[PDB]
Structures are given as structure tokens and as C-alpha cells.
Design a protein around this ligand. Sequence first.
Ligand SMILES: Nc1ncnc2c1ncn2[C@@H]1O[C@H](COP(=O)(O)OP(=O)(O)NP(=O)(O)O)[C@@H](O)[C@H]1O
Ligand SMILES: Nc1ccc(-c2cc(Cl)c(Cl)c3[nH]c4c(c23)CN(C(=O)CO)CC4)cn1
Ligand SMILES: [Mg+2]
Ligand SMILES: [Mg+2]
Ligand SMILES: [Zn+2]
Length: 342
Amino acid sequence: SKLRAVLEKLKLSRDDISTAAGMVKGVVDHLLLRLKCDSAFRGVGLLNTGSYYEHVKISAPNEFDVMFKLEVPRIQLEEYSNTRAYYFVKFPLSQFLEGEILSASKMLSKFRKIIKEEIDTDVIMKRKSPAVTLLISEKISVDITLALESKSSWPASTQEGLRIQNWLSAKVRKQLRLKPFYLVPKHAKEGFQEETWRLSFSHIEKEILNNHGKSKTCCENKEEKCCRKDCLKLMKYLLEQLKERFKDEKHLDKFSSYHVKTAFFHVCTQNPQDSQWDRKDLGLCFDNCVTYFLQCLRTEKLENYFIPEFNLFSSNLIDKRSKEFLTKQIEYERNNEFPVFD
Ligand SMILES: Nc1ncnc2c1ncn2[C@@H]1O[C@H](COP(=O)(O)OP(=O)(O)NP(=O)(O)O)[C@@H](O)[C@H]1O
Ligand SMILES: Nc1ccc(-c2cc(Cl)c(Cl)c3[nH]c4c(c23)CN(C(=O)CO)CC4)cn1
Ligand SMILES: [Mg+2]
Ligand SMILES: [Mg+2]
Ligand SMILES: [Zn+2]
């Protein structure tokens, strides 16, 4: 009942939803119209992503993630430095070519420049993530991310990813792998290799979260109201609260809600049946998520759900001392019934 009461507090107000949805639409629509006038961005289209469009945004609808996707035919990818997730792209995009290489930084710079010049709305741009980040009315943040869309087969680094066959089905895995993949202008470390792009499957994360049960009717009727999204919301709030309490501790700076989202997908793979997420077992299901995440921190292993050889918890990305620090705080919370929720 304590956790149910937490979830009630995390619910988004209907009035805040209605107001925020309109504020975002006015800004997104204006920017799309302007970008389409530029020869380079003429084919841009909207793809809504992230927690709001997955219905796992908590507390307030004050942060929205959108991709401005651009179909680019006939791309050839070259993996950068065995990073598994970062690539060079080769083939009105000639202005962005360095030789045969399509520069992520040059395309992002023009995209940001156009947005900056274009912004009944108070809109400011936050300093230069692949996103151009806007703040509407001092309240609503919007991450606008240029994304190249490729309709080709997914890169080889994904061959063993997306291990959903025992949960969502092999047929679904095959359908999802026929969808496009995206490249966003987030550069690999080098200093950054400023031509490099990063693979993204944010659209598939949304597809899974909004169609998340083994039963096709999961969450469509009162007898099948599972606790999967509630558990992700509680894990997100646990991490948010810890990061806020420890905001002056560097140890928590590199953790993000994507770490809990990725751990959560792995728990769904481990626990594929809807009866393992029954509403009446909320506390146990949340505990399964917390203990799984603790195991990831201890073993220093959290594979990207789509790119298994990309380890989000590698010491190259997050120091061992930082993972041990977060382990200590989560263990204290688990051992004391989550006082950070009170
Ligand atoms: N480290 C990462 N690796 C890959 N994709 C990422 C990473 N961080 C963020 N993303 C993607 O960017 C999207 C938006 O990021 P963000 O707004 O930080 O998180 P979110 O999923 O929307 N949850 P929230 O904290 O509620 O905003 C995520 O849903 C992911 O698809
Ligand atoms: N609309 C979207 C969706 C997906 C991506 C995105 C994609 C990839 Cl592959 C990576 Cl590694 C990413 N890292 C970050 C993001 C991102 C976006 N992001 C936030 O949204 C912070 O609130 C920062 C950090 C970007 N914008
Ligand atoms: Mg978000
Ligand atoms: Mg964001
Ligand atoms: Zn469900």
C-alpha cells in the first residue's frame, strides 16, 4: 500500500498534460515547418520518443523527447574503434560531407543554428547529448534530436540484442528488426570524433513499453492490469530522488533513468510471463527490479538491450567507486522500506 500511494503521487495531472501537450505542439510544429524550408532538412518528420510517449513519465509532464527524423537512402556504416554503438556514415547533404564521410557535427551545427534563429511562447535554448534542448515558459524541457533514418538491416552489433523471443515472441522480434534504425549526432570519445553518429532504437523502446505483455490484451482490461510500468516508474523515482538528495555528490552524476530503463527491460526478459507482474505482487515485483539493478551494479554489467557488447556499466563509462556508492544508497533504501519515498 505504501508503494501504491507513491504511485498515486507520481501520476501526471490531466490539466498539466493538456497544457503541456499544446505548448510542445506549438513549438514542434513551428520548428518542423521552418526546417522543411532548408534544402538539407526538407524531408524531416516527427518521431515522439522517451518517457512521456511511453507513459512512464513521472510527477509532471515537464520533459519531452522528440526525434526529427530524416530518411537518408543508401547509407554505408563503418564502426568506429570497436565501440559497437558509434559509426561513420558514408553514402542536399553534400554540404556536410568531409570526403565521403557525412559529418555528424556539421549536420548538427546547421540543425541547431536553424532552430536557434527560429525560436505566444517564451522559448530559450539550453547550452550545447545529441539533442537541441529547449525550455518552454521556464517549465517544459524539450529535447529535439536530429536522427538519420535507415531502412536497411540493423548493424551487426545488434545481432544478439533484443532478446525478447520468450516474452514478446520471435515473430515480434522479426517484425521489430524490419523497422528502420536511427543514427543521432552523439559523438564517440577520442576529445570527440566529431564525425561520428550513435545508433538509437528509441522507437523500439517505445513499441515495447506500449505493447509490453505476453498477452496481447495486457493492460486492456481489469483482469490483465500488470505492474510492469508501475515498477519502471518506481525505479525511475528511486533514482531521481537519490540523485536529487545527493546532487552535490559526484558519484551519482553519471547515472540516468536510461540505466534503470535498460535494467528494467532485462528483468522483463528474465520474467516473461504476465503472471510474474501481477498487480497484487507490486512490492515483490519492485523488489525484483531493485535486486536486479543491484546485481548489475555489483557485477559492473548492464548490457545495452539492443547492443549487447555495449556495457553501460563499464568502468570506461562509470567508475567502480560510483557504482559502489549507488549500491550503498539503494541497499539502505531497500533495507529500510524506501524512506526516500516518504
Ligand atoms: N545512455 C543512453 N543510451 C542510449 N539511448 C539513450 C541514452 N540516454 C538516453 N537515451 C535515449 O533518449 C531517450 C530520452 O532520454 P531522457 O529524456 O533522458 O529519458 P526518458 O526515457 O525520456 N525518461 P525521463 O527521465 O522521464 O525523461 C531515452 O528514452 C532513450 O531512448
Ligand atoms: N528524442 C531523442 C531520443 C533519443 C536520444 C538519444 C539517443 C541515444 Cl542513442 C543516446 Cl546515447 C542518447 N543520450 C542522450 C540522449 C540520447 C537524449 N538525452 C536526453 O533526452 C536527456 O533528457 C540526453 C542523453 C535523444 N533524443
Ligand atoms: Mg525524457
Ligand atoms: Mg530527454
Ligand atoms: Zn500490462
